[PDB]
Amino acid sequence: SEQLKHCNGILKELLSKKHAAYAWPFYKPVDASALGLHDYHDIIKHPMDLSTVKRKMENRDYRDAQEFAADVRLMFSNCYKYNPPDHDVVAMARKLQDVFEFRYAKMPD
């Protein structure tokens, strides 16, 4: 579908060098043990990250654009839930989500 091509384009942009300075914490699943975040999976019940969204897009797991958007926003919501708002990862999340939301709002009819 046309809308899922738009989603795939957004995903390509989120993973591109253009945004790499702030997108990189979202490239792969949070490795809680490696980062010393031993409470992460007590707080975040449904982890999400861009490599998982990419795999689901490639396997045509998204029935529509709404399902894709729900995973992307889940990613950002997990970051806002786990991390205090003054932590740098939150400023990075907000910049990346600005990129996402403004382009997602251009979804072709």
Binding site: A21, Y22, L37, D88, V89
Partner: peptide
Amino acid sequence: WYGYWKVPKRKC
């Protein structure tokens, strides 16, 4: 912003 953490999640 420089691609790594000085302190994970908290400090670039």
